Structures are given as structure tokens and as C-alpha cells.
Amino acid sequence: GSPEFKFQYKEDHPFEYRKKEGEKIRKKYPDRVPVIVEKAPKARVPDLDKRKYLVPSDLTVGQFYFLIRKRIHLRPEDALFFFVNNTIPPTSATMGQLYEDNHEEDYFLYVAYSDESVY
């Protein structure tokens, strides 16, 4: 295929493809979950070529946040907030906990990141 940089609205329409993709990746990697990576407005964070990712279900939210913090090389004083499908889980939860809470007919997980929480 080809790389693209567009919002979820693109894959929000082909429900048949979104399901097929979720179904194939669920069977290919059931110990992992497909995650959408998107930056929210008002943020002050660098961009990286990451749109669609796959993470293990057993990864603790605090650890996951740390890996991405180090990935974006933010200052230690730099604020950072993550939102999984409009919700804010505790850092003691795991990717499998939020994946269960977000279980959909498409089987995709949406994750947003920002410097400040501003709709």
C-alpha cells in the first residue's frame, strides 16, 4: 500500500474494511491491540511518523506513557496528557483494561495525546 496522514474519519466510513483489519490483526496478534496515534490541538509536542501502532495488552499504562514520553524527548517539566477514546484511565491500569472498556464492533483502540487538555 502507501503511507498516509489523515484522521480516523477516513477509516470511520469503510466499516467493512475496519472490521476486516481488526479481525485479521486480532487473529494475527491476539496478545496485542491495534492503537491509533493522534495529537490533539493546543499541544506543544514534536511529530513522529506514527499513525497506526500495535501494543501488547499486558503493558501497564504508566510504562506505556513513559515509553512515549522518552520517544518524544520532552523536558521533565513538560506537561503531557493521554486520552484513550475520550476517557482518562489510571496509570496502574494496563492496555488490556482499556481495550476491554473500549471493545467495539471494529476492534480498534483510539489514543490521543496533548500538552494541555483543551477541547
Binding site: E16, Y17, E21, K24, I25, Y29, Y53, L67
Partner: peptide
Amino acid sequence: GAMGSASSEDYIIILPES
């Protein structure tokens, strides 16, 4: 449609041997 791939679908996995 009906997909007929061989290679897995495009998704960046982040899972090293560690």
C-alpha cells in the same frame, strides 16, 4: 470486497524480545 494478502496488514508493532 475480498482481500487476498499474504503479508500481514500495515501496523507498526512495538514489541522487542525484551
